[PDB]
Each structure stands twice: as structure tokens, then as C-alpha cells.
Amino acid sequence: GSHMNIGDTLNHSLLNHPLMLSGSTCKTLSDYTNQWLVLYFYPKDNTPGSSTEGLEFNLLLPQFEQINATVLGVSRDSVKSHDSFCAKQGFTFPLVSDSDAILCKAFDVIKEKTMYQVIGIERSTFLIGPTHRIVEAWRQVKVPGHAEEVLNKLKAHAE
Template sequence: MTIRVGQPVDDFSAEATGDTAFRLSDYRGKQLVIYFYPKDSTPGCTTEGGDFGARIGEFEAANTVVFGVSRDGLKSHENFKAKQGFPFELISDRDEAVCKQFDVIKLKKMYGKEHLGVERSTFLIDADGKLAREWRGVKVPGHVEEVLAAARELNG
């Protein structure tokens, strides 16, 4: 079943940085931004994470918690987070369960070859656990500002 705006997001749990186990239901009462990115320590993913990190105080003021998700392992995530100084946790989705739940695994082309990869996507979940907004096929420049504006609007 594909996740849809206005529908509750099925609860899930996954390993995250900072020795934390992420569980969606633990964040009821807060808004959540869950952004999916292709790979740790690559230029676009570093820029996107940095953009979210630079605005983290504004997201917190809008009652919104930010998490990044990729298929990289926890060790890679911890290194990426530490090197970039991200003030939020990264979720490891090695088995692609979370990626599949949000339908972000897509056929991509790189250097003329096709492969399955993570489509850069962001999801805003409201305080009741319903999907409020989604952005798929994200282009990094200006994206975080758009997500922040939506979080502020939702927080009312």
C-alpha cells in the first residue's frame, strides 16, 4: 500500500545514530520531517543535510523533529553526522523496509547504467501521525525553506 497525504503513517521502527532506536509512534504530539537521501558523504546529500542542520532551531520552534534516512549502515551514518556536525539523527535502512513503506526506491540511471536507488524525497508527518505533505524527486536548492514553511503552516 502506498502512503498517501491525509492518511495515517504506519508505525515503524529502525536503528538510528546516537544509539537510538527510532519508533514513529514515540513522536506523537510532534511534527516529523523524514527526508530520504541516496548516500552518505556525497555532495548533494551533504548539502541537503547541511541545509536542514542550519535551520534546525527554526524547525524545533515549529514543533518539528528532523530525521534523515538512507540505506547506509550506522557506522557510515555516525561518521557522516560527526564530520558534518548534523544536529539531528540519521536512520539506517539497510533492509529498505522504511524506503519501501514510503515508496522511494526508484529505477535510476547513472553513467548510462540503470540501478535501483533512493529517490531524494521528504515527508512531513503531522502531530497525529498523518502524512501532511510529500516532496518527491527533490532538488536540493531551496528545498529546506519550502519544508520549513510547510511545517510552520501546519503548526499554525
């Protein structure tokens, strides 16, 4: 089905790709070496589904940080859009503005659906381990309770 799968290792080009984040900050996925990263993709800022998803992760954020994990959300919206969405919702973790669709294509989350050409992000989340391998991959994500399922999966690995 997809070209980024559990067991795959992020390559050097992807690990060093510059990420534009909310707050006008920048990071690369390599900054998360030796920690777990939850990288969650959502279709569009400021929708009922993506604000619920954000809020569910935001509530759990201390529990993730307590076991050496953190969260980054991703859509192709602008930094300006992300900052308005972070502020309105009170998100404490960052959002990647993937405005060149590089992470979206890398993680193979761009899909073609129904209405009614819609090409856009299929809601998807990856749990990336401390050596940059895909440990879990959820595709066609259903929003409610997803952030807690993710947390519990990470806890289940932590034993």
C-alpha cells in the same frame, strides 16, 4: 504514482517498526506522537547533494524545534557510515540507518533510474503530523533551498 500519499495514516506495523539511528540509538515513528516530523530520504551518505541537504536542515533545526517539529534523515547506509557523516558535517539531528530498506519501501521511495540496474532512493521528504498522517510529500526533491521550503510549508500550516 506512489503508495504513500498526502492524507494517508502510518499503520501500526510501520509506527512500531524499530529504527536504528546514528549514535547506536533506536526509536520508532510512534515516538513522535503529538509532534511534527520531517522525514527526509536521501540516496547515499557523503555526497555533495546529501551533505548540502543535511546542512540546510541542520541550520534550520532550531526553527523547526520552536514549532514542535523535528527532523530525521534516512538512507540505507550503515550506522557506522552515518556516524562518520554526522561527525564530519556536524549534524545535530539523527540519521536512520534503514539497512533493511523497510522505511524506504514503506514510503515508496525506491525507484529505478538511468545509468548507463540502478535501484536506489529517489530523494523525497514527508511532513508527518502529530496524529501520524502524511501532511506534505515532496518527491524528486531538488536539493538547494529544500529545507527552507519545508520549514516554510510547516509555518504556512501553523498559520
